Every structure is written in structure tokens, then in C-alpha cells.
């Protein structure tokens, strides 16, 4: 009952039927988890300040539109 061990025949054709999908672009799934901790911690504070500034900017824009 000796059978055949292993072959790679038809594997490339199967992989290329629904062809080799390209990689996810670098603007997607750019998670920083596992990276160098000090830079991550500093960037978190910078992003805190940026979020507060964005809220302030939106409030100023609303006030200006109401004024005009």
C-alpha cells in the first residue's frame, strides 16, 4: 500500500487562480504596538495636545461661521 510522498504540482496554479494578492498599503494597519516605548509614550502626549487643538480649532471655526 505504498503511496506517493509529496509533490508541489498544481500548487502554483491553485495559488494564481485567485492570484497572489498584493500587500496591504503602508497607510493601513500602521500600528505602533511593540515599538520602542519611550518614543511611543512621547508621541502619545503630542497626540493628546493635537486632539485638544483640533477641538479648539473646530470651535473657533463654528464661532467664525456664526459671526459671518
Amino acid at each position: 500500500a505504498k503511496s506517493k510522498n509529496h509533490t508541489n504540482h498544481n500548487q502554483s496554479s491553485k495559488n494564481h487562480r485567485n492570484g497572489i494578492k498584493g500587500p496591504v498599503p503602508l497607510h493601513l494597519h500602521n500600528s505602533k504596538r511593540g515599538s520602542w516605548l519611550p518614543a511611543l509614550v512621547n508621541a502619545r502626549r503630542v497626540r493628546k495636545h493635537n486632539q485638544k487643538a483640533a477641538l479648539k480649532k473646530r470651535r473657533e471655526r463654528i464661532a467664525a461661521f456664526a459671526a459671518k
Binding site: 487562480r17 485567485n18 494597519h29 500600528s31 504596538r33 471655526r61 463654528i62 461661521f65
Partner: protein, 197 residues
């Protein structure tokens, strides 16, 4: 013979009819098929496409969500211009977490009794799609809105829960069972909560 390998892979499943048995849904589809083919507006085309869709793809929207998005739009809108008509191809449901809402004109396939009461009591109007086609035939000054699908319990179960980076709920009737091995680091490995993609 012409070499056309992988030519059925290019074709997509497009449905031009509704599985719905509702005669009124059929009437709306007839009217908006006419409007979509005879008018240049893209609003009619999008509404006609959404009328064909299934119930699971026409997710319900909430009155609080409508109020919030319409406020975000009402700011940065001139005081002379009127507020748009909030049009949803779906159901509008009341939100008990928002008691104070403005007077908005809302068009939908169905309103819950509480949502209709809240919209009318706030000073607004509950419109139907024939009324919308009557007053805004090309859908000018309308806010086309959609309901949320990502929070559905079916969506939270999709995918294998035993692969790293997966937080899908297992199909289990017992919550206590299926919590020991593969869920705990102590009991012979734990599924990794994060995977870089």
C-alpha cells in the same frame, strides 16, 4: 476559441429585483426605478439601489444619530438655508438616551411608534418616500443616511476566535464553558490578543 481564463472572476453578482414580498416596497421600487432612469440626480439612483437591498443590508438608524449628524451639518450651514430632509432607506427607531431633539423632517421606510411620536412632538414631520418624491423629485437638500451594521451580534461572531488577534465571540450556549485552555496563559497557552497585520 478565445483565451478567456478567469473571465467569470471579473463578473459580480448584481440583483435588479427585490426578494421582498411587500407590494408597497414593490410600488416604491417601481417609482424610484422610473425616477432613477429618467432623472440626472444621483440621489434617485442611490435610493433605487438601496430599495432593492435586503433587510439585513438596510440596517436601522436611530433618532439620536439622526439628530447628531443633522446638528453637525446644521453648523456650517447658512441661517437663510433650510435644514435638509433626513432620508433613510430603512427603519427609524427611538432613542431613550436623547430626550431633546430639534424639529427635523425625516423620510423613511418605517417609523416605530415611539420614533414617530418623538419626531412629531419635537415639531418635525415623518415623511414617506412618495411624499419625498413629490416635494423633492431629484432629492435636493436631502441628507441620505444609513444605519449601523458593525455592532451586530452576528458580526461579532464572524471569524475564528482561536487565532491570534481575533476577538470574535465563540458560538457557545454556556458562557462558563470554553474558558480554560487557549483562553488562559496558565492552562497551556493563551490566544494572542494582538497580531501585526
Amino acid at each position: 476559441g478565445v483565451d478567456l481564463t478567469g473571465i467569470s472572476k471579473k463578473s459580480r453578482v448584481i440583483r435588479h429585483h427585490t426578494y421582498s414580498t411587500n407590494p408597497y416596497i414593490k410600488l416604491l421600487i417601481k417609482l424610484y426605478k422610473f425616477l432613477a432612469k429618467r432623472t440626472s440626480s444621483g440621489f434617485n439612483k442611490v435610493v433605487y439601489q438601496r430599495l432593492i437591498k435586503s433587510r439585513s443590508n438596510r440596517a436601522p438608524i436611530s433618532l439620536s444619530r439622526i439628530a447628531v449628524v443633522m446638528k453637525r451639518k446644521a453648523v456650517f450651514t447658512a441661517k437663510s438655508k433650510a435644514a435638509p430632509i433626513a432620508v433613510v432607506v430603512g427603519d427609524v427607531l427611538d432613542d431613550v438616551r436623547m430626550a431633546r431633539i430639534p424639529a427635523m423632517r425625516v423620510c423613511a421606510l418605517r417609523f416605530s411608534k415611539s420614533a414617530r411620536q418623538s419626531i412629531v412632538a419635537a415639531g418635525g414631520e415623518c415623511l414617506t418616500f412618495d411624499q419625498l418624491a413629490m416635494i423633492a423629485p431629484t432629492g435636493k437638500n436631502t441628507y441620505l443616511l444609513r444605519g449601523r451594521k458593525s455592532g451586530r451580534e452576528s458580526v461579532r461572531h464572524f471569524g475564528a476566535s482561536g487565532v491570534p488577534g481575533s476577538h470574535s465571540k465563540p458560538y457557545a450556549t454556556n458562557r462558563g464553558k470554553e474558558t480554560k485552555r487557549g483562553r488562559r496563559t496558565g492552562r497551556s497557552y493563551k490566544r494572542k490578543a494582538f497580531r501585526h497585520v
